Amino acid sequence: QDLVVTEDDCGTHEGIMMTPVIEGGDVKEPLRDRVLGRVTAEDVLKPGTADILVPRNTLLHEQWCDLLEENSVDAVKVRSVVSCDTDFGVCAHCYGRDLARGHIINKGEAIGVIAAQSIGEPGTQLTMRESSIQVKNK
Amino acid sequence: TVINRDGQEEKQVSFNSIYMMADSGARGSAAQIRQLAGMRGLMAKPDGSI
Amino acid sequence: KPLVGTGMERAVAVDSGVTAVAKRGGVVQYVDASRIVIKVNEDEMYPGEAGIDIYNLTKYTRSNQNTCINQMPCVSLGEPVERGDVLADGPSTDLGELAL
Amino acid sequence: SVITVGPYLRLHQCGLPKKMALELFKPFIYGKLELRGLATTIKAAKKMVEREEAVVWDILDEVIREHPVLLNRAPTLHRLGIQAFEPVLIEGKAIQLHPLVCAAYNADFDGDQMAVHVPLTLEAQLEARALMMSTNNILSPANGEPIIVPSQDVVLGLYYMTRDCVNAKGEGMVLTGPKEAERLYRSGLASLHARVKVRIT
Amino acid sequence: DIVLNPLGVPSRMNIGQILETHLGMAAKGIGDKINAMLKQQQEVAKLREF
Amino acid sequence: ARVTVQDAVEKIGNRFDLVLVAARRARQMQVGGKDPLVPEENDKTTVIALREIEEGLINNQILDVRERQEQQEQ
Amino acid sequence: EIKELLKLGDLPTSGQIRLYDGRTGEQFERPVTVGYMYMLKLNHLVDDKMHARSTGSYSLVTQQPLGGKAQFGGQRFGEMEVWALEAYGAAYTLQEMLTVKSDDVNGRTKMYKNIVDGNHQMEPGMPESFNVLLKEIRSLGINIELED
Amino acid sequence: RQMLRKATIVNAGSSDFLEGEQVEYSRVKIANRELEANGKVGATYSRDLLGITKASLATESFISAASFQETTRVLTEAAVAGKRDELRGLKENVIVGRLIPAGTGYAYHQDRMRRRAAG
Amino acid sequence: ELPVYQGETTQTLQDYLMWQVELTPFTDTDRAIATSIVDAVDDTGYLTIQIEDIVDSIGDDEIGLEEVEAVLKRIQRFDPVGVAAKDLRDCLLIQLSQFAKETPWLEEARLIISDHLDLLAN
Amino acid sequence: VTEFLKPRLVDIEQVSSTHAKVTLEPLERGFGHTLGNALRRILLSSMPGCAVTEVEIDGVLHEYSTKEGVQEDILEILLNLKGLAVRVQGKDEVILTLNKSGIGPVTAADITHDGDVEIVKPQHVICHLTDENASISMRIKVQRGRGYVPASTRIHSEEDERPIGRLLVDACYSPVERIAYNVEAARVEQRTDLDKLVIEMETNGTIDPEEAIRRAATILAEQLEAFVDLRDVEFDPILLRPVDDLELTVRSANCLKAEAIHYIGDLVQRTEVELLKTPNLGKKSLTEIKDVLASRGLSLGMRLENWPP
Amino acid sequence: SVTEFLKPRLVDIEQVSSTHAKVTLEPLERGFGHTLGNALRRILLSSMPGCAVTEVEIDGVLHEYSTKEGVQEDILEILLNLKGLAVRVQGKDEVILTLNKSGIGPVTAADITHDGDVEIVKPQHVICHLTDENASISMRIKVQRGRGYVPASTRILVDACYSPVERIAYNVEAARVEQRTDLDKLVIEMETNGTIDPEEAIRRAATILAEQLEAFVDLRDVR
Secondary structure, eight states: OOOOOOOOOOOOOOOEEEEOOOOOOSEEOOOOEEEEEEEESOOOOOSSSSSOOOOOOOOOOOHHHHHHHHHHHOEEEETTTTTTOOOOOOOOOTOOOOOSSSSSOOOOOOHHHHHTTTTTTTOOSOOOOOSOOOSOOO | OOOOOOSOOOOOEEEEHHHHHHHHSSOOOHHHHTTTOOOOOOOOOOOOOO | OOOSSSSSHHHHHHHTSSSSSOOOOOOEEEEESSEEEEEEEESSSSSSOOEEEEEEOOOOEEOSOEEEEEOSOOOOOSSSTTTTEEEEEEEETTTTTOOO | BBEESSSOOOOTEEEEEEEEEHTHHHHHHHHHHHTTTTSHHHHHHHHHHHHHHHHHHHHHHHHHGGGOOOEEOOOOOSSGGGGEEEEEEEEEEEEEOOOOTHHTTOOOOOOOOOOOOOOOOOHHHHHHHSSSSSSOBBTTTOOOOSSOOOHHHHHHHHHHHSSSOSSSSSSEEEEOOOHHHHHHHHTTOSSOOOOOOOOOO | OOOOOOHHHHHHHHHHHHHHHHHHHHHHHHHHHHHHHTTTOOHHHHHHHH | OOOOHHHHHHHHOSHHHHHHHHHHHHHHHHHHSSSSOOOOOOOOHHHHHHHHHTTTTTTTHHHHHHHHHHHHOO | HHHHHHHTTTTOOOOEEEOOOOOOOOBBBSSOOOOOOOOOOOOOOOHHHOOOOOOOOOOOSSSSSSSSSTTTTOOOOOHHHHHHTTTTOOHHHHHHHHHHSSSHHHHHHHHHHHHHTOOOOOOOOOOHHHHHHHHHTTTTOOOOOOOO | TSSSHHHOOSOOOSSOOOOOHHHHHHHHHHHHHHTTTTTGOOOOOOOOOOOTTTTGOOOOOOGTTTSSOOOOHHHHHHHHTTTTTOOOOOOHHHHHHHHHSSSSHHHHHHHEEEEEEHH | OOSSSOOOOOOOOOOOHHHHHSSSSOOOHHHHHHHHHHHHHHHSSSSSOOOEEEEEHHSSSSSSSSHHHHHHHHTTGGGTTTHHHHHHHHHHHHHHSSSSSSTHHHHHHHHHHHHHHHHTTO | OOOEEEEOOOOOOOOSSSSOOOOOOOBBBTHHHHHHHHHHHHHHHHHOEEEEEEEEEOOOOOOOOOTTTSSSOOHHHHHHHOOOEEEOSHHHHHHEEEEESSOOOEEEESSSSSSSEEOOOOSSSOOOBOOTTEEEEEEEEOOOOOOOOOGGTTTTTTOOOTTTOOOOOOBBOOOOOEEEEEEEEEOOOOOOOOEEEEEEEOOOOOOHHHHHHHTTSSSSSSSSSSSOOOOOOOOOSSSOSSSSSSSOSSSSHHHHHHHHOSSSHHHHHHHHHHHSSSOOOOHHHHHHHHHHHHHTTTTTTTSSSSSOO | SSSSOOOOOOOOOOOOOEEEEEEEEOOOOTTTTHHHHHHHHHHHSSOEEEEEEEEEEOOOOOOSSSOTTTTSSHHHHHHHHHHHHEEESSSOOOOOOOOOOOTTTTBBBBGGGOOSSSSEOOOOOBOOOOOOSSSOOOEEEEEEEESSSSSSTTTTOOEEEOOOEEEEEEEEEEEEEEOOEEEEEEEEEEOOOSOOOOHHHHHHHHHHHHHHHHHHHHHHHHH
């Protein structure tokens, strides 16, 4: 409950890698929603060397997402709030929006409530609970 | 569902009410329909066994 | 009364005790919205008795659930009632069958 | 109060009974009576309210017109639990709810009740109008996908409306676009018809 | 006199209520036939046979 | 009726400070002394203030200038 | 047997029949089943569930209203409702909900006076329950005071 | 992040061996001591994971702690500590009844802070 | 089922007379007078002391005797009209002035009450 | 607009006293369905009918009670009288007495005869008697109304109160009670192909079929007069007496005449601080004005919206 | 008192354009808005006098399928544009039109020869497409009278839409007069393809609906 947005700029270029998870049999989640409401790292790399697509201070409005879906990118670093902070509150760009609004998050919104409420909202999960390797495609 | 036609080669999607409710996604599912027409299945768990 | 039931409605309405069942009764002589009298046959009553049975119907008595209870006679005049038959219908009862 | 469903309401509106909208908005009615000169004192306003005069209902309809009210279900485990709407003077003893917002409230109207609160200050009204309206919470905060998605009836209706069996009445003909609504009511053509060419802009 | 939701029966498996409804319709058809035979003043034999 | 608050939000861009700006203007309109710049349509002071702010006229800067001018004139 | 009884009662075998709209007078395609059913009335009418109050009597401790219907009292505003309001940023709404509605006997009176006069102004004051808690804690060997 | 606090340090670096200082502080100290006077006062630390409930026990504002766990104990802990809360937690303000430092109240709190030194 | 059994704060014809004071518009000085006046009201309904007594108890020689009268002339048309009467007779005067002048013998009754109650006493 | 031939009503059929099989006439393609639908919803929603409105018995006191000597309850008597059919003449609000003694079931045939009162189905029973000395006497007031009116939405008709021993019953005012229609081909083939719908209808036996049809077509013809020519393209304060009677002692009247003071209310919408800005009046004059308006002006406190002439 | 009903007094119109119109009626009796709305919708859409093209005879194959011959427009699109053509005849039942425009620009509606009774409300309507350099064809079309709508299957190529109204809809809302609510209020939206004033269309539909019932009443209960 003690989380309040008090800083506008993060100040660091650190982050965490974001790649689509695969279980071998099928892909569980593509790289379209894990980076949807995310701000890219200091620099994104294309399949062709000496090329950049977006700078470090641009939010993805699903247009650059559709663009990346055409370029078939796989290695994209995403700035997070656990790796980057200002010793107080949460920086804006380092959190994205991912809410009922289309703009960026504004200073003062209670992140600490929407988070830890969206986690406990699904309170209807459940109660009280080989040798060879085949391939699917080429 | 076969309907009258000169070629009678329709093989079109049926218009059953429960089937439409299931396919459209309004209410129900295949697991709920199979307990109404076919067999419900195992459906037994008095304890940690079957 | 329900157009489709199970048959146990009669037994439920009888064993509920909310209605007015008939005991050692014969020919009925007079009925009313609250009072009924029945003249028992000669071969049924014991000697030393007039041979009449009175029944007072419950009329608009407050219940424990803030509701109403009422009884009405099912016979009109000059009708014989055997032992074990119903005489009046209480709340949510129709002709001895439970009608909720 | 007991919550019910209403198909004629709007996404940003709610139906409140006239008896309940009179006890809650009592200070507002007193203020309006003292302003319009219909009640010379507070005692006169109270006596007019207790007697339920004819002008009292008109004044209540004038006052409750643009005053938001926040309604919420008792079991709430997310942010979409509390949302504000605009009152609508409807008879009866049941608060009417919008059908699309039910998914946010997780209600089926099988007997559940509803809680209602009336803001007083201007800032509370601004916070309810700019941050607590259903027209602002269309998407889910936990996902971002639209949570205002229709219910079972609307989906089934839209699914059955766009179909075609084999060659039902009104098949193979060419026509305009929005003009196709005339043939439906006039029985000139069925809503289910394949191979139909229409002008679409 | 009463209108319900047809979306309930698929998920909430209550075919029993629909069977009860069909049986009540049959019983009301029979009752309407008996009432017609009583209002049209037929003999006691026809009513007894029916 | 400002059914949806989107124009004034775009004009402010904070979503939180818009409530604070429209609060004092609506309070001034309710207490008196100020006339609505936009033509009223039988609405309340809050709706009129919000619709005037959505028109790009009233914001957090114009009100301060007006208050300073009123203080200097008196 | 149901089908046989339907056939005997001059009724369709399936149970469906054509119906007409009471507003447009048009035949309904896909005929719907018709029939009678045994309905029950429950004891959950709105004659007693409906409640409404703007002001009334308060309790002697912390000056808070009641919860029942007789002697009109407010409902339970649990933590799950205010936690939702924290996610909206409505600081003034929560303040007027927790200060000038239950506690702050002078605050709610000033609120009532301003609503009657049309000023629509509030004050935070001080919750009576906080003072009750302070008085209950000071009864033990704990010293708490308000410095400035 | 809410559970990645309460780290421990190994070096003194002009600071006592507290073994549990808050990561925030464990950085701010450095940010105030390294570039200002001497960087050699920098002390390496290891971010240790703490239980989601145990982290709650690290709440310094006892007023916003009694409502989360056993009251009496915490109360006594504060008493023997003789500490102050200064009303730095949202729940705290709520118990007091003023505007929360979040949302529409954020700006308000900001002004309050502007009234600390300047006024 | 805690400390207070239930606990309820009854209103009463003192708190109800205080309620009205707030709603009504007086100045900061008129408000005090009125507070003082309603303190003097008893269960029966009569200002207990006196007119000039309130003026002498307010300790300020400035405030006129009519000042209190002015306030006291408006407090006694509050809820039950005729509250805070002055010696079981001004009640009638206040209560009568209230309803309309279309009543049949208002003149006569006013004249009776004004100076002719001693005679009615017998 | 080529021909548009009207439907001349002919061949009215009356099978029984309740059911009817009135046919309509020869009409244009498409008019039959819409005409049947427009005539069905009007004949059922808006139709005058004479139904039992009030019953008053001497012996009984309230509904939830019983009378010694009868079989059915008093509440059932009202439920049986609620479905009585009667056609009243030109005059309205007819009241008739009903008295009977014996052991036979009291029917509708043993009702005191009146000139304007007619009964169509006297073969229904109202109550039952089980004692020779039992006698019943009551009165019934019957009125005419457009449609169903409950007792809780009529109970307000009385100006203040109703004498003990007077109970109200629900009113139906819908004597039709069953109406349907069906369309088929037309009898005459020489002319351009047409249709012919028949309005089948079972009433309660109060109003004639042809009268209801004509009256059910005259309501839909007069209501369509607004769609034939589209055109079109008080609250005051009680206190309004003048400044007189306020007993202006010396200078109050002069100050009111010099300041252009209005009748009453303009002095009430003023502040005591701004009153001192007026010409010299004095604290004594201010207190006198306050004491005077303490009975009529109410402490000179009010915020009015506007002032009409 | 039992034969008197309520009449709509708020008959204000709030049309936007010359074709689109929305007429609102606040005061109405309960259970009467739907009846009148459906009656008007069924009368004005299935029985209404008007003019429309019934058949076309263009030079080429008698079948509907034909080539472009430099027009570059499909033969199905040419027949569709002739369906939505507002033609009005003054005092004749059937009439013929013939025109052959040189292939230099877009074929507008003003290319039809002006007759004594043939009138067009919009001469800028699109009829054909621009040819390549020299392609030109003769129209040789004809129009007749009729009511309602007639498809191509029942009667004869281009569908004859005699109904002038393009779209019609009605909605019912709740309203109160002084005390009682739920009284239905009707709002009728309508769009007509010119040549007829929307309000005049409603007036003519109401007069047609009323003139078919004056004989069934025979001056009974009239005031």
